[PDB]
Amino acid sequence: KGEELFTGVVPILVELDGDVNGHKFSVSGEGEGDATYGKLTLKFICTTGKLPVPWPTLVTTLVQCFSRYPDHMKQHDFFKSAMPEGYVQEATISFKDDGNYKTRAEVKFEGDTLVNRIELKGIDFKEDGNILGHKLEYNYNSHNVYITADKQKNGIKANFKIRHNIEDGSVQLADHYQQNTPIGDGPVLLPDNHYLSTQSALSKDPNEKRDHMVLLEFVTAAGI
Numbered sequence: 001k002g003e004e005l006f007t008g009v010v011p012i013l014v015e016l017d018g019d020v021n022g023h024k025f026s027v028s029g030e031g032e033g034d035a036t037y038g039k040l041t042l043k044f045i046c047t048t049g050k051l052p053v054p055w056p057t058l059v060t061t062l063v064q065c066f067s068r069y070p071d072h073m074k075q076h077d078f079f080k081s082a083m084p085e086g087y088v089q090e091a092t093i094s095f096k097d098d099g100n101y102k103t104r105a106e107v108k109f110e111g112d113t114l115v116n117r118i119e120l121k122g123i124d125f126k127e128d129g130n131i132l133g134h135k136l137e138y139n140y141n142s143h144n145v146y147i148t149a150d151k152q153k154n155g156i157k158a159n160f161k162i163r164h165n166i167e168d169g170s171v172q173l174a175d176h177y178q179q180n181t182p183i184g185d186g187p188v189l190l191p192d193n194h195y196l197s198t199q200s201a202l203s204k205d206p207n208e209k210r211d212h213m214v215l216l217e218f219v220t221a222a223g224i
């Protein structure tokens with residue numbers, strides 16, 4: 001039944017409150033998703049001033065229900081199956097040789113809009129490390145998100161490594177460990193092992209003076 005809510009274009013709202021090494025900030029995002037094509041278009045704004053971390057470090061925190069699941073994999077789409085009541089998504093993002101983010105989000109429908117509400121806490125970042133030193137390029141590599149079922153929580157786990165390009169040609173690794181659990185009492189789809197193939201393009205709105213990020217993303221399920 002939840003997949004029925006995604007056959008057309010769906011408006012998206014994202015609201016994040018963050019604290020990284022005591023630097024407090026908020027981000028508001030608006031856009032739309034079209035799961036038929038695994039396509040997301042979003043604009044995020046830092047509503048509190050300057051973002052204290054690089055925008056690319058927030059991309060995985062800032063709605064995998066818009067993935068394109070091929071018809072032959074439709075029985076493996078947990079994310080849509082949990083809608084409209086939604087799911088809780090928790091992650092730990094470990095930056096190699098640096099600090100970590102812990103996030104908690106609720107993703108659910110509010111009327112006909114898909115909403116992602118997030119709290120992010122970052123600790124033990126190095127002041128002149130790649131994150132607080134803002135040494136990351138404004139770009140995003142393509143990645144696979146590996147999904148496995150968590151039968152005991154009636155949900156799923158996801159594991160992946162993000163490779164963030166550093167301005168000097170090196171790479172900043174970020175290990176991601178995520179868990180999702182449904183909010184409602186109805187049944188959800190528990191998938192076989194598979195992955196999400198993601199591609200993301202970051203840009204700016206040339207008329208915008210606030211600190212912001214324009215994102216175009218494609219997400220396709222595969223491996224089955």
Ligand SMILES: [Mg+2]
Pocket residue numbers: 165169
């Ligand atoms: Mg390079």
